[PDB]
Design a protein around this ligand. Structure first.
Ligand SMILES: CN(C1CCCCCC1)S(C)(=O)=O
Ligand SMILES: [Zn+2]
Ligand SMILES: [Zn+2]
Ligand SMILES: [Zn+2]
Length: 572
């Protein structure tokens, strides 16, 4: 019941009983909370409640100290002090932003903006509060019960009346009943069991609601600039492959933490692995939020770093298949490749945290909590996609509010910028350089003359809220008959449902823009599907078109984004 003040750091016995996290508030700060909000329950060693039998007064503002006990106006003795007086709430050892964080429902962009412009203590309060609110909202959704099992990949579902149904995409992971984790896709519905189980009729599925542990470590440890490379030992012999990164590698060693903005195909992976060859004795932990991002780092390491000095950390509650070619779960290997949520408590010379636009302030804290490191390197691109904010429905989250790293990259700039895209035909590089990179991204490849745009609004149907554009898929089908080179194309759209329809009609493999991020394909077909904030989002548009190595077809709904594609237009 005794701790330090979320705002002041001041010792107190006061916690807010109304805040979902129950934060330590100092006497000056507890007042400014309770006097400005619906938050009136204060706690010290016991509740600030009226001690008179039967009395229901809990509001600290209506309470007095009578000796050692607390009483309302109705029950206080003649010799009593009000608990709230002279800007303070009585307790042992005797803010606008804290109040908005404590009380908001996290449905508004402005809530995320504040969780990222605030002081560092308040970022942790925000990130733990938000995460708590995110988890207790899962409980709101209906249970799914198996009506009839059709096949090994399809069934019919019965949905609890009175509660809403959760979106049926890969984003929403269910637990079966403990028959392992399942996903569903769109009365026939497509099921995918982590454990391949003979799905029983009357079995039920629920969204995993995991307890939110407290945060302790900052999002970013305090910045430290050094005059000399600190705690690392450079090679004199560095392979010519990594020659271009040597100055950035020296920056990494002359600061506590460094940021790298690397637009698509600028060599982020190459930078991350090349850091281990430049500091060849350094113990390096490679981390990202997703298994995919960690596995991409493993693929690069396999090529360039000694396999026997590499461990892939795999949580015993194994969900998706991942990287098999390293020793699994050897924490003390020089090179450790591990998702944020599986990190062990350990030390490192260098922590490399990849795909930083996908990280939350919660993840940033967890990393600083589990890893004691001489140097922290934050790699990604704030012009790419953030973690979905499931509670956010009003306003758009700008990249400067994605997390602490992205705020730094969008305000004071990144420490390091990889400026040459080696993946994408120049048509794409030039479009996205003007769009999100203030013309600082350069094309290494020539124009491919395999980059086409068609402005075709089509007709928008919806499976629930998920968009479908059959006519845009019809145009693609027409195009594929005349463009056989594209038979190998990956079909990409901002909507799972459009992808499910494109899958049946075209037979192309299929990706949402959000699942496409980090991957590349020779040929890409993009159907915008709809003009929504989702489909017109420049970060998502950026990721969509930078997947392509050789060609892209964009069937567009949005005049602005259509006109900005530096592509050959088609017609039909
Ligand atoms: C994250 N929590 C606080 C924030 C202040 C900085 C130190 C951690 C303790 S809380 C108030 O959410 O439990
Ligand atoms: Zn305080
Ligand atoms: Zn409160
Ligand atoms: Zn009373």
């Amino acid at each position: 019941a005794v701790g330090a003040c979320v705002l002041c750091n001041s010792q107190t016995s006061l916690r807010c009983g109304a805040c979902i996290r129950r934060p330590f508030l100092c006497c000056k700060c507890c007042y400014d909370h309770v006097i400005s909000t619906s938050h009136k329950l204060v706690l010290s060693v016991n509740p600030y409640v009226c001690n008179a039998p039967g009395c229901d007064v809990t509001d600290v503002t209506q309470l007095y100290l009578g000796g050692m006990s607390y009483y309302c106006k109705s029950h206080k003795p003649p010799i009593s002090f009000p608990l709230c007086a002279n800007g303070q709430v009585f307790g042992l050892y005797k803010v606008t932003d804290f109040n908005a964080i404590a009380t908001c429902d996290w449905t508004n962009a402005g809530d995320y903006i504040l969780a990222n412009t605030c002081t560092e203590r308040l970022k942790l309060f925000a990130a733990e509060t938000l995460k708590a609110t995110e988890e207790t909202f899962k409980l709101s959704y209906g249970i799914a019960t198996v009506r009839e099992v059709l096949s090994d990949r399809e069934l019919h579902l019965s949905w609890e009346v009175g509660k809403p149904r959760p979106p049926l995409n890969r984003n929403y992971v269910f637990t079966g009943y403990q028959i392992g984790e399942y996903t569903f896709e769109k009365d026939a519905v497509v099921y995918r069991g982590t454990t391949t189980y003979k799905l029983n009729v009357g079995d039920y599925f629920v969204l995993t609601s995991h307890t939110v542990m407290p945060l302790s470590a900052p999002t970013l440890v305090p910045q430290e600039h050094y005059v000399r490379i600190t705690g690392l030992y450079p090679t004199l012999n560095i392979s010519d492959e990594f020659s271009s990164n040597v100055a950035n590698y020296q920056k990494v060693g002359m600061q506590k933490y460094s940021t790298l903005q690397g637009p698509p195909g600028t060599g982020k992976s190459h930078f991350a692995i090349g850091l281990a060859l430049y500091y060849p004795s350094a113990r390096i932990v490679y981390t990202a939020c997703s298994h995919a991002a960690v596995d991409a780092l493993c693929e690069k390491a396999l090529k360039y770093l000694p396999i026997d000095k590499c461990s892939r950390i795999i949580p015993a509650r194994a969900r998706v298949e991942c990287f098999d070619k390293f020793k699994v779960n050897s924490t003390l290997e020089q090179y450790v490749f591990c998702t944020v949520n599986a990190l062990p408590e350990t030390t490192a010379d260098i922590v490399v945290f990849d795909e930083i636009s996908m990280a939350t302030n919660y993840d940033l804290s967890v990393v600083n909590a589990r890893l004691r490191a001489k140097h922290y390197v934050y790699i990604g691109d704030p012009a790419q996609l953030p973690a979905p904010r499931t509670l956010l429905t009003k306003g758009t989250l700008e990249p400067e509010y994605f997390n602490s790293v992205c705020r730094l990259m969008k305000t004071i700039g990144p420490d390091m910028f990889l400026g040459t895209c080696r993946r994408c035909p120049a048509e794409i590089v030039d479009t996205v350089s003007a769009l999100v990179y203030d013309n600082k991204l350069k094309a290494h490849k020539d124009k491919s003359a395999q980059c086409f745009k068609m402005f075709y609004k089509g007709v928008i149907t919806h499976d629930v809220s998920s968009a479908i554009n059959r006519p845009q898929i019809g145009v693609v089908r027409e195009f594929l008959t005349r463009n056989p080179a594209w038979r190998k194309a990956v079909f990409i759209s901002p909507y799972n449902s459009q992808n499910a329809v494109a899958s049946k009609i075209l037979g192309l493999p299929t990706q949402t823009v959000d699942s496409s991020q980090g991957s590349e394909y020779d040929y890409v077909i993009f159907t915008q599907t709809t003009e929504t904030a989702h489909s017109c989002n420049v970060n998502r548009f950026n990721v969509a078109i930078t997947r392509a190595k050789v060609g892209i077809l964009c069937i567009m709904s949005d005049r602005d984004l259509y006109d900005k594609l530096q592509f050959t237009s088609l017609e039909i």
